[PDB]
């Protein structure tokens, strides 16, 4: 499998490359050491915080303060590179960028971003869609894989199938940004798994051909699209791909008489000449590109890299697949070589005003190729007729008259063409039945130019649609979660706030500037000077959408989601009539060409108005194609692609930071994730909330079986303000910023466990015993040290005499302090602390042995007990219960604790009772074989027998342990009788050994002092030795 093999291209090519900042309390800040230039970012590290505001470091070295609410806090390097944006705590724009910067550098172009997918044009050619890498992300689910656009198209079929629901993919972004490149790897990716195949190649051949009559090299895109589109690929209900339809929106038919500075025509007319047989280039009377006026005007007529003749031989291919016939074929060709011959016409003044042709081989190679009478064509471009009353007389038109007019049915060709294979594309691709369809939108996003038209006017009309699709969808998504799960919160409409913009265009009751510009349209003697005063007329000072500038008498402007626009009224009339001379109509109707002919009888296309329609302008007729499109839209799942360029020199790996935080603004990536943060944008399930802030609770298991009272417990004891969250159904909602705050909590907390694993090394593990061994099991296997015996064999009397005051009668973890003489030289009074019991002091060791005698209602959960003397040594030790019916869970509950490596097993054995067949020395030796970790403490000492002695065993030789064995005697049951404190027995005890006819040799190797000692030194040196591994599994249980 792939996605798990390292050394394989999908984790070379997808996947970012690979207890630092573990115990670090460290938190750093972006800024921009420059007030003016709010795009470039430092990090900066914050070392000092108010209630309501930040202190950091700054890069020169001075420091900063900033309020928390301005604050563009940064998250943790740990998450650089997150395949998914929404999973970070802070989400402003500098971390935002970060995160892209930090994978666009590792040639990772694509990542998430709520209902986003977010691509990063590389500029470069990147090996992540090849046939397996298709294969790879099939079936996978957003999740089980790193992001791409085949992820996404795969999201979008399965759901096409588990829902039997249409779905559509909106691809947008600026020029150049990447559009049509990842509309063509969806429907690749479509093809394949639900697709070598008749079909499946012609649906995937068309783009080629639509391509090169719609695109174009424009001076931001070598590859343009001139043009928006609608793919719908159409499935049956089985799910394989039973067809295809195509809709084409705006072509951008000036394109074919004039092209700016550097900028090219629509490619095929360069294939055209280049790739053209040479029986083609005689018949069709071609020439090099320079010889045509279309075409040698803007200085560039090659792209590099690009050979059009190659090209040429691709969109001919194209169109044998498609369908296209060989007749067909040359009748394309002839009406593309036919309208660069119209181009070259050149006229001229007359004798008189009007026009005349002098030379006419322009004309006649147009009127060979177009399949038109030479003469009539002549007439109808300067001498078009016009009906007056019941009479019929022609014009003569002056050379500006008549060049527009040759260039009107240029236009009116290339369009028509255009619309014309669309047509005999869908002819083939689109079945009238289709059990469902996955939709992709491949347009331009807002479009604002220094010099702005109707034909921005359109394609910002339309994305004030869409933005207003997406805004609504987000709405409906954030709505159905809260019902879900039942979180009491209404938001306003989202989409309601673009309306008023959207009306202020193409409303009717209250006139629209489409309905008045139709209106003006169709007026006698209008002109763009009677438009542009109408629409002042209606909405200066009317609508707050709308503006009159201060000077422009022939400009408008128009607030638009992305900004406000200024547009021209220059030519809007014309443009929004698209005028062509009816003798010119009639002059193409007579065409000998099958093709030509069509373009001027189909009325799906000749005409805007179908059979039966009175008369529709340009501005209504898109105004319908566009309701249409939402409509359909509007019966689909919608799926989100933002493209974005990385820079305005098409130029790999660089990535700047104001071309992109730029797009990142109007694009809806940073108002997406912003129109949310009103309400609960963040919410968890239970279970995985608990799983990770258990630690900030006490008594809470990371597993805890009732999920939402855990999640309740620890919202209460960290003080969360109610109103900042909410309990649903499944998952716990928060208002935004209160779960960042939580996961601080959890940061902070996390450092203050840790940093100390770095003497008072007991102090440390005795922290994290608290924190996690109180449940009742030992899941880091923390290094302790644990107490064992048989039943009355002298435990209690041990840690009685270690504590050095009774104070005993479950697992007991005691916890030793040792308490320095205070700085007055007075001595400290010895108390003791419980762990279920946070603020209680026990100075009474009586209501201690009582205390316990309490909780214990045999269980595994351990009774927490901390002691402050200033009469003991710092130790920490676990005491179990003495040793085949409940005994039997005893010696499990041992053995458990007994089991582990990083626990030393202390031994506790009576001299009374032999050592043949012992017990607790045996029942150590199972689980420590070699006798490498368990130390023995033999007691009774005093009351052996006669000459009975041990000192074969307190010198190690009997039962051999590394750690050797202690003798010491406790107060006997009559000892306990009246008086006699611990403290007496000790006294006692040392004389023992002192004056005792063997053991004095050993004297002081023996007693209570000795074992404590020693006790803590084992300790002392175990936790060092274990600190190197126990580190690591601290840092995985954390992750
Ligand atoms: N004379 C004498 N009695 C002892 C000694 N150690 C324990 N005992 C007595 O043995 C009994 C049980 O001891 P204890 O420490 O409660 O044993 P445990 O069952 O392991 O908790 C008590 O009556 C103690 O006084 C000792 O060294 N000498
Ligand atoms: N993912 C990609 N891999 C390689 N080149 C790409 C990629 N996306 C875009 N490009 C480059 O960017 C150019 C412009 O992309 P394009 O999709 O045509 O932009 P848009 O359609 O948004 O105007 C491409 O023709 C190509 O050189
Ligand atoms: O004018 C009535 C309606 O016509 C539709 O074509 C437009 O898309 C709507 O936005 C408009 O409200
Ligand atoms: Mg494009
Ligand atoms: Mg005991």
Same mark, same amino acid.
């Given at each position: 499998?792939?996605?798990?093999?390292?050394?394989?291209?999908?984790?070379?090519?997808?996947?970012?490359?690979?207890?630092?900042?573990?115990?670090?309390?460290?938190?750093?800040?972006?800024?921009?050491?420059?007030?003016?230039?709010?795009?470039?970012? +430092?990090?900066?590290?914050?070392?000092?915080?108010?209630?309501? *505001?930040?202190?950091?470091?700054?890069?020169?070295?001075?420091?900063?303060?900033?309020?928390?609410?301005?604050?563009?806090?940064?998250?943790?390097?740990?998450?650089?590179?997150?395949?998914?944006?929404? +999973?970070?705590?802070?989400?402003?724009?500098?971390?935002?960028?970060?995160?892209?910067?930090?994978?666009?550098?590792?040639?990772?172009?694509?990542?998430?971003?709520?209902?986003?997918?977010?691509? !990063?044009?590389?500029?470069?050619?990147?090996?992540?869609?090849?046939?397996? @890498?298709?294969?790879?992300?099939?079936?996978?689910?957003?999740?089980?894989?790193?992001?791409?656009?085949?992820?996404?198209?795969?999201?979008?079929?399965?759901?096409?199938?588990?829902?039997?629901?249409?779905?559509?993919?909106?691809?947008?972004?600026?020029?150049?940004?990447?559009?049509?490149?990842?509309?063509?790897?969806?429907?690749?990716?479509?093809?394949?798994?639900?697709?070598?195949?008749?079909? +499946?190649?012609?649906?995937?051949?068309?783009?080629?051909?639509?391509?090169?009559?719609?695109?174009?090299?424009? =001076?931001?895109?070598?590859?343009?699209?001139?043009?928006?589109?609608?793919?719908?690929?159409?499935?049956?209900?089985?799910?394989?791909?039973?067809?295809?339809?195509?809709?084409?929106?705006?072509?951008?038919?000036?394109?074919?008489?004039?092209?700016?500075?550097?900028?090219?025509?629509?490619?095929?007319?360069?294939?055209?000449?280049?790739?053209?047989?040479?029986?083609?280039?005689?018949?069709?009377?071609?020439?090099?590109?320079?010889?045509?006026?279309?075409?040698?005007?803007?200085?560039?007529?090659?792209?590099?890299?690009?050979?059009?003749?190659?090209?040429?031989?691709?969109?001919?291919?194209?169109?044998?697949?498609?369908?296209?016939?060989?007749?067909?074929?040359?009748?394309?060709?002839?009406?593309?070589?036919?309208?660069?011959?119209?181009?070259?016409?050149?006229?001229?003044?007359?004798?008189?005003?009007?026009?005349?042709?002098?030379?006419?081989?322009?004309?006649?190679?147009?009127?060979?190729?177009?399949?038109?009478?030479?003469?009539?064509?002549?007439?109808?471009?300067?001498?078009?007729?016009?009906?007056?009353?019941?009479?019929?007389?022609?014009?003569?038109?002056?050379?500006?008259?008549?060049?527009?007019?040759?260039?009107?049915?240029?236009?009116?060709?290339?369009?028509?063409?255009?619309?014309?294979?669309?047509?005999?594309?869908?002819?083939?691709?689109?079945?009238?039945?289709?059990?469902?369809?996955?939709?992709?939108?491949?347009? *331009?996003?807002?479009?604002?130019?220094?010099?702005?038209?109707?034909?921005?006017?359109?394609?910002?009309?339309?994305?004030?649609?869409?933005?207003?699709?997406?805004?609504?969808?987000?709405?409906?998504?954030?709505?159905?979660?809260?019902? /879900?799960?039942?979180?009491?919160?209404?938001?306003?409409?989202?989409?309601?706030?673009?309306?008023?913009?959207?009306?202020?265009?193409?409303?009717?009751?209250?006139?629209?500037?489409?309905?008045?510009?139709?209106?003006?349209?169709?007026?006698?003697?209008?002109?763009?000077?009677?438009?542009?005063?109408?629409?002042?007329?209606?909405?200066?000072?009317?609508?707050?959408?709308?503006?009159?500038?201060?000077?422009?008498?022939?400009?408008?402007?128009?607030?638009?989601?992305?900004?406000?626009? @200024?547009?021209?009224?220059?030519?809007?009339?014309?443009?929004?009539?698209?005028?062509?001379?009816?003798?010119?109509?009639?002059?193409?109707?007579?065409?000998?060409?099958?093709?030509? =002919?069509?373009?001027?009888?189909?009325?799906?296309?000749?005409?805007?108005? %179908?059979?039966?329609?009175?008369?529709?302008?340009?501005?209504?007729?898109?105004?319908?194609?566009?309701?249409?499109?939402?409509?359909?839209?509007?019966?689909?799942?919608?799926?989100? !692609?933002?493209?974005?360029?990385?820079?305005?020199?098409?130029?790999?790996?660089?990535?700047?930071?104001? !071309?992109?935080?730029?797009?990142?603004?109007?694009?809806?990536?940073?108002?997406?994730?912003?129109?949310?943060? %009103?309400?609960?944008?963040?919410?968890?399930?239970?279970?995985?909330? !608990?799983?990770?802030?258990?630690?900030?609770?006490?008594?809470?298991?990371?597993?805890?079986?009732?999920?939402? /009272?855990?999640?309740?417990? $620890?919202?209460?004891?960290?003080?969360?303000?109610?109103?900042?969250?909410?309990?649903?159904?499944?998952?716990?909602?928060?208002?935004?910023?209160?779960?960042?705050?939580?996961?601080?909590?959890?940061?902070?907390?996390?450092?203050?466990?840790?940093?100390?694993?770095?003497?008072?090394?007991?102090?440390?593990?005795?922290?994290?015993?608290?924190?996690?061994?109180?449940?009742?099991?030992?899941?880091?296997?923390?290094? #302790?040290?644990?107490?064992?015996?048989?039943?009355?064999?002298?435990?209690?009397?041990?840690?009685?005499?270690?504590?050095?005051?009774?104070?005993?009668?479950?697992?007991?973890?005691?916890?030793?302090?040792?308490?320095?003489?205070?700085?007055?030289?007075?001595?400290?009074?010895?108390?003791?602390?419980?762990?279920?019991?946070?603020?209680?002091?026990?100075?009474?060791?009586?209501?201690?042995?009582?205390?316990?005698?309490?909780?214990?209602?045999?269980?595994?959960?351990?009774?927490?007990?901390?002691?402050?003397?200033?009469?003991?040594?710092?130790?920490?030790?676990?005491?179990?219960?003495?040793?085949?019916?409940?005994?039997? #869970?005893?010696?499990?509950?041992?053995?458990?604790?007994?089991?582990?490596?990083?626990?030393?097993?202390?031994?506790?054995?009576?001299?009374?009772?032999?050592?043949?067949?012992?017990?607790?020395?045996?029942?150590?030796?199972?689980?420590?074989?070699?006798?490498?970790?368990?130390?023995?403490?033999?007691?009774?000492?005093?009351? @052996?027998?006669?000459?009975?002695?041990?000192?074969?065993?307190?010198?190690?030789?009997?039962?051999?342990?590394?750690?050797?064995?202690?003798? $010491?005697?406790?107060?006997?049951?009559?000892?306990?009788?009246?008086?006699?404190?611990?403290?007496?027995?000790?006294?006692?005890?040392?004389?023992?050994?002192?004056?005792?006819?063997?053991?004095?040799?050993?004297?002081?190797?023996?007693?209570?002092?000795?074992?404590?000692?020693?006790?803590?030194?084992?300790? @002392?040196?175990?936790?060092?030795?274990?600190?190197?591994?126990?580190?690591?599994?601290?840092?995985?249980?954390?992750?």
């Amino acid at each position: 499998d792939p996605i798990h093999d390292r050394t394989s291209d999908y984790h070379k090519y997808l996947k970012v490359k690979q207890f630092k900042l573990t115990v670090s309390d460290k938190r750093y800040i972006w800024y921009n050491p420059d007030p003016k230039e709010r795009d470039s970012y +430092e990090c900066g590290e914050i070392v000092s915080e108010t209630s309501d *505001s930040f202190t950091f470091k700054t890069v020169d070295g001075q420091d900063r303060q900033v309020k928390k609410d301005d604050a563009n806090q940064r998250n943790p390097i740990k998450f650089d590179g997150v395949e998914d944006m929404s +999973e970070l705590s802070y989400l402003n724009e500098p971390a935002v960028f970060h995160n892209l910067r930090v994978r666009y550098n590792q040639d990772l172009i694509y990542t998430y971003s709520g209902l986003f997918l977010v691509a !990063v044009n590389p500029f470069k050619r990147i090996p992540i869609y090849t046939q397996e @890498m298709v294969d790879i992300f099939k079936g996978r689910r957003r999740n089980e894989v790193a992001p791409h656009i085949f992820a996404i198209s795969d999201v979008a079929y399965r759901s096409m199938l588990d829902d039997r629901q249409n779905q559509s993919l909106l691809i947008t972004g600026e020029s150049g940004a990447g559009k049509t490149e990842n509309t063509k790897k969806v429907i690749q990716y479509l093809a394949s798994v639900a697709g070598s195949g008749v079909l +499946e190649q012609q649906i995937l051949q068309a783009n080629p051909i639509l391509e090169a009559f719609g695109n174009a090299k424009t =001076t931001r895109n070598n590859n343009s699209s001139r043009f928006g589109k609608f793919i719908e690929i159409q499935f049956n209900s089985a799910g394989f791909i039973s067809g295809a339809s195509i809709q084409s929106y705006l072509l951008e038919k000036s394109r074919v008489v004039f092209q700016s500075e550097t900028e090219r025509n629509y490619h095929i007319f360069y294939q055209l000449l280049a790739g053209a047989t040479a029986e083609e280039k005689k018949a069709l009377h071609l020439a090099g590109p320079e010889s045509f006026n279309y075409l040698n005007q803007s200085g560039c007529v090659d792209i590099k890299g690009v050979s059009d003749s190659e090209e040429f031989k691709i969109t001919r291919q194209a169109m044998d697949i498609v369908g296209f016939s060989q007749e067909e074929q040359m009748s394309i060709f002839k009406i593309i070589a036919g309208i660069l011959h119209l181009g070259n016409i050149k006229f001229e003044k007359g004798a008189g005003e009007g026009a005349v042709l002098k030379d006419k081989t322009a004309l006649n190679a147009a009127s060979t190729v177009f399949g038109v009478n030479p003469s009539v064509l002549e007439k109808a471009l300067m001498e078009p007729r016009i009906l007056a009353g019941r009479d019929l007389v022609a014009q003569h038109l002056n050379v500006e008259k008549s060049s527009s007019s040759r260039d009107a049915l240029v236009k009116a060709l290339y369009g028509r063409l255009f619309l014309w294979l669309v047509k005999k594309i869908n002819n083939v691709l689109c079945q009238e039945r289709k059990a469902y369809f996955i939709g992709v939108l491949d347009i *331009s996003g807002f479009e604002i130019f220094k010099v702005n038209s109707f034909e921005q006017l359109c394609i910002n009309y339309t994305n004030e649609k869409l933005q207003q699709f997406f805004n609504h969808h987000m709405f409906k998504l954030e709505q159905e979660e809260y019902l /879900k799960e039942k979180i009491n919160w209404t938001f306003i409409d989202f989409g309601l706030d673009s309306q008023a913009t959207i009306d202020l265009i193409d409303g009717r009751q209250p006139p629209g500037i489409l309905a008045l510009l139709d209106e003006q349209s169709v007026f006698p003697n209008a002109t763009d000077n009677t438009l542009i005063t109408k629409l002042h007329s209606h909405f200066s000072k009317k609508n707050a959408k709308y503006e009159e500038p201060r000077f422009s008498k022939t400009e408008f402007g128009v607030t638009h989601y992305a900004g406000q626009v @200024m547009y021209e009224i220059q030519d809007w009339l014309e443009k929004n009539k698209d005028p062509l001379q009816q003798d010119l109509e009639l002059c193409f109707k007579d065409s000998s060409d099958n093709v030509v =002919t069509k373009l001027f009888n189909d009325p799906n296309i000749a005409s805007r108005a %179908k059979k039966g329609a009175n008369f529709i302008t340009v501005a209504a007729q898109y105004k319908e194609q566009l309701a249409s499109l939402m409509a359909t839209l509007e019966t689909t799942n919608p799926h989100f !692609v933002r493209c974005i360029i990385p820079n305005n020199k098409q130029l790999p790996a660089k990535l700047e930071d104001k !071309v992109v935080l730029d797009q990142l603004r109007c694009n809806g990536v940073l108002e997406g994730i912003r129109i949310t943060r %009103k309400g609960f944008p963040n919410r968890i399930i239970y279970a995985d909330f !608990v799983k990770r802030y258990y630690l900030l609770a006490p008594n809470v298991p990371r597993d805890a079986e009732d999920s939402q /009272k855990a999640t309740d417990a $620890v919202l209460k004891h960290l003080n969360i303000d109610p109103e900042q969250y909410r309990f649903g159904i499944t998952k716990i909602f928060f208002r935004a910023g209160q779960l960042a705050r939580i996961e601080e909590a959890r940061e902070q907390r996390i450092s203050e466990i840790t940093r100390g694993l770095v003497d008072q090394l007991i102090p440390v593990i005795n922290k994290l015993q608290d924190v996690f061994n109180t449940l009742g099991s030992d899941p880091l296997d923390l290094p #302790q040290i644990v107490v064992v015996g048989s039943q009355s064999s002298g435990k209690s009397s041990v840690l009685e005499n270690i504590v050095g005051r009774d104070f005993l009668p479950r697992p007991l973890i005691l916890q030793l302090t040792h308490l320095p003489i205070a700085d007055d030289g007075s001595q400290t009074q010895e108390w003791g602390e419980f762990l279920h019991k946070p603020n209680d002091m026990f100075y009474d060791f009586s209501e201690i042995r009582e205390e316990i005698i309490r909780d214990t209602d045999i269980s595994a959960q351990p009774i927490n007990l901390k002691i402050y003397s200033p009469h003991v040594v710092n130790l920490t030790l676990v005491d179990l219960p003495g040793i085949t019916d409940i005994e039997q #869970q005893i010696r499990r509950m041992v053995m458990a604790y007994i089991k582990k490596q990083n626990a030393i097993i202390v031994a506790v054995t009576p001299a009374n009772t032999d050592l043949a067949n012992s017990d607790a020395l045996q029942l150590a030796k199972e689980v420590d074989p070699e006798g490498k970790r368990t130390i023995g403490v033999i007691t009774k000492l005093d009351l @052996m027998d006669k000459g009975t002695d041990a000192m074969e065993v307190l010198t190690g030789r009997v039962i051999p342990l590394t750690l050797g064995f202690i003798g $010491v005697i406790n107060r006997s049951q009559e000892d306990i009788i009246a008086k006699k404190s611990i403290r007496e027995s000790l006294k006692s005890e040392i004389l023992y050994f002192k004056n005792h006819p063997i053991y004095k040799s050993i004297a002081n190797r023996s007693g209570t002092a000795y074992l404590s000692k020693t006790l803590n030194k084992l300790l @002392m040196f175990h936790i060092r030795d274990t600190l190197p591994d126990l580190k690591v599994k601290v840092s995985k249980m954390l992750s």
